[model samples]
Target: TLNTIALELVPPNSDGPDGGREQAVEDARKVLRCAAETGLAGRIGHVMIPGMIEEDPDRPIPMKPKMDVLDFWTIIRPELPGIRGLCTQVTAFLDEPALRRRLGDLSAAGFDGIAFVGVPRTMNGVAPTDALSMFADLVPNRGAILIPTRDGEQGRFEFKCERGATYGMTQLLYSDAIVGFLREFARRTDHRPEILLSFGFVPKLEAKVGLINWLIQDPGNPAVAAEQEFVRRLAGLEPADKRKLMVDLYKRVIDGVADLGFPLSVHLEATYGVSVPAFETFAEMLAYWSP
Candidate 1:
């Protein structure tokens, strides 16, 4: 998986009027079509498919019956490979036996790996790093979620890697906290695990960053204002200018982590529908990175 990039395919959720099984499949199709158009299909290293609601905060958000990730994979597996199923919502499993049985089902289904993410803040639930080890015997490849802006996160990622996480992807980044975090990560440990910096297309709607924040795990406290400002800058730019801006940011980030190793995780979406600009942006990045 040289120069690998993991792309998260939005799962079937009950957020919209037509947001279930069929719509989800069509959404996957929409993203894959963009991949084909931009020649990004082959460049994709892993498709991170969320099994349940991937995001959970202490705050309440509406929820409804969601399509199981395995069923979606079964429908899309023929067209896409390197399917990395998300370890089910960490809070759902009450015991190790349940975790093993659930993960065993996924591992047996040919899901190549697992990506585990915890909530935005600490609570009574098991964090991903701690849970990963318990499932290591069943699933060979594991990944962790990184919030670069979080205190102690670099070591958190390192800890997860020590447990068997082969890679980590940050939440949708609107700030350059990643740069500082990477520098610190490199400082803290010589260990590396294909850290993929997530970048999504700027929103094309009212309250751009607010809409975007809904999609990303909030990087609480001091980073919030900085993220808002950066996203505002994105909304202020013209479409072509915006694309240039994101690509330039990509260049800056990659330059910092070049020798250290930095992969990508592009969100093939916008505030609305499939973002062609997002696809185009990845196409440009793929060409420049030559992954």
Candidate 2:
């Protein structure tokens, strides 16, 4: 049961000269404490490497980056031995030397998983197949390499699924996409990696409030009305009430996994103010219905 859940840990935001060292430590401590409470200490499957540098709005070119993610794993790994860290890279943008140097840095830093993200603007650059083949040999060991299958982005999926096999990727991560994508891809292609369904909490009032605002601007859009009504009912709820609703949603998510018989992973996002409830809710559900 405990083996079924994966927590995607978030590192602290930093603008300080010390690279948010103090805050990063505190966040790591908090994560360790939560995992320990959930009886999942030292069982992290992956840690996210979020956008460390701001990509240009116009050209989406990266600026001189402040790579604080290195600081994140450096401080967090010692706290949770045997944990595997995952780093996300823009494979399309890096050249051979730059890519090798980055992977070497991550490997030396103790990372064991990689997720290659495609750069939208670099469609004309080196083909993904060539790039994936290059990374397949260079990455440290045969670690779990992952690529996303964004809903309706079949081109990306086909591109990844075709070459992902030779690269030794044994898992696919997806979001808000039809489960059929996995089924169909598995049927047509040889890339049959374990599929992990990704879910995250959209904090109570905030989730629907934002949607309702958008619906208000375009009242004719019928697609959003259902969600708008859902949020309208909880418009003035207490914090405790909101927590209950969020917890119930978490249970339903787990139930779906049980019915479908697939592995479950979560975006345990602490930044959105539901960290404690989100962690506790998942721990509670997994305790009862984990497969």
Candidate 3:
């Protein structure tokens, strides 16, 4: 019944191992322990959906068996009350049935959701529909299926959302693109599922902005400068100038659910030298503008 702002809560330090499968499990367990400590346990009402693979164009990573992950979750789930569910990113090129069976295994293991993270995609490519059909064939009778958007028209997938799916997550898209994306989606579908927008808040300043651009292609660049100068420059800019140069870029992204008459559920995180509080302030501003 609640709108979801599904953030990637697992700490990046032990996300996965650099070596063998055993090390990978150990890394995942480490993340569970970290999630328990970061107050993410109490905050995640819907699901602590983690990204299993690296968010890169060419990183071909394979997860350990779903049965193994499910067993790990069984032992860790009791310790983390807020981690109500789990998700995975099945490779886009892999055999669909094998991926589906893996999703079924996660459901059998008592997961609350089975999710997909599709990349190297554009909004016009119909990636969302492909992801929906893939998961539907996988764990049809079990927990909800969550699909992460990589930018483009997501509305076409609305017909796929069912009682089993709690919602969909969009990529770290620009604000203007976000608004149009949601609007177009609304035009196609009568009712909307919960939609969460991803953002990055990084403290490293320059490096983090680079990371943001690398992962999402754009966004978080303004964080590289001193806050005072950044604010001053922002205020000095003309409204139209700001729209094309700055605000509009992110505004469309931030007002996503609201623009489409969907409830606002924010997924907060930092990138490129931004602090947690700073990111929270950003999320607040985005939510405040909802009308």
Candidate 4:
């Protein structure tokens, strides 16, 4: 079984070749220390290091440099001895040869995991699954190939299963039905690739319920009538009640997946401005919570 958490280090407006690089590294080190202290040393697996892009999304700043993800990884990864490196590979615009070259670079850079992500909704790029297939072929033995199962999008899991990924990671799973889909994925894949369930948390108690609604519930479902009513009631639940609901939700998935003897990884998003205690809670869950 594999257990891991995702730490996003780059600042929102970090500029490369000038400033904001050291701060990002320092922040990463802080999180690594917390994981080590909380009994999650080796198990603190994947780190999401988003690569550099133009400062302005719509307009290209060809001259201006932005913080390089590879350089950031090179500096920070060695500092934490136990954690494995994971980065998002955006290959939507790349041709076949360019795609292979990018994978080769990642392998040489010593990344142990990569998530094949599509271009943003606003941008154009290659198909996500096509990138996944190319990634698997180029880095078959290099590291883990992770496919994103975005809110029960059709064919996401099937493509990942057919491509033979090292694991399938969910976008956000808050509903029992979505959790069931994760189990279904394991069965269809014959438990070959592990499943990593993602959970995101904000620091505020009041916003937690709302965050759950936005992140977990599938707004695109056909049964909109039922979902709207359920979410309204769910938002009215007390903070402790909401917490209990999430705890129970996680426990159910953990137990159910474990019963099938499948590997599972839980990724708690390390949101900025969150309290130390919040991270402590996540560490405890990652370390001790099991089937």
CA-lDDT, candidates in order: 0.65, 0.49, 0.45, 0.55
- TM-score of each candidate? 0.81, 0.66, 0.54, 0.73
lDDT of 3 by residue, 175-243 (tens): 344565567767866656665555444332433234443554324434222332333343355534433
Top-TM-score structure, candidate number: 1
True-vs-predicted CA distance for residue 76, candidate 4, Å: 1.3
lDDT by residue for model 4 over 109-184, one digit each (tens)? Answer: 7665666665443454455566666656544522233323344443556665566556666554444544556556
Order of quality (TM-score): 1, 4, 2, 3
Candidate closer to the true structure by lDDT (higher is better), 1 or 4: 1
Model 4, which residues run further than 4 Å from truth? 1-12, 36-42, 50-66, 135-138, 141-154, 186-191, 205-245, 273-275
Give the clashing pairs for model 2. Answer: none
lDDT per residue, candidate 1, 123-157, as tens digits?
33445667677767666666677888777786777
Worst 10-residue lDDT window, candidate 1: 264-273
Q: State the displacement of the C-alpha of residue 259, model 4, in Å, after optimal TM-score superposition.
A: 2.2
On residues 1-291, what C-alpha lDDT tens digit does candidate 2 reach at each position? 113244555555555676767766676677777777767665555555543222333443333324356677787777656666655566566777777777788777876555555553323333334555555544432222332332334455556546652222322111212344444555566554344334444445555334323322225544334434544444456656744665565565455334343343543443243266556655654555543
- Deviation (Å) of 116 in candidate 3: 2.2
Write the number of the candidate with greater TM-score, choosing between 1 and 4. 1
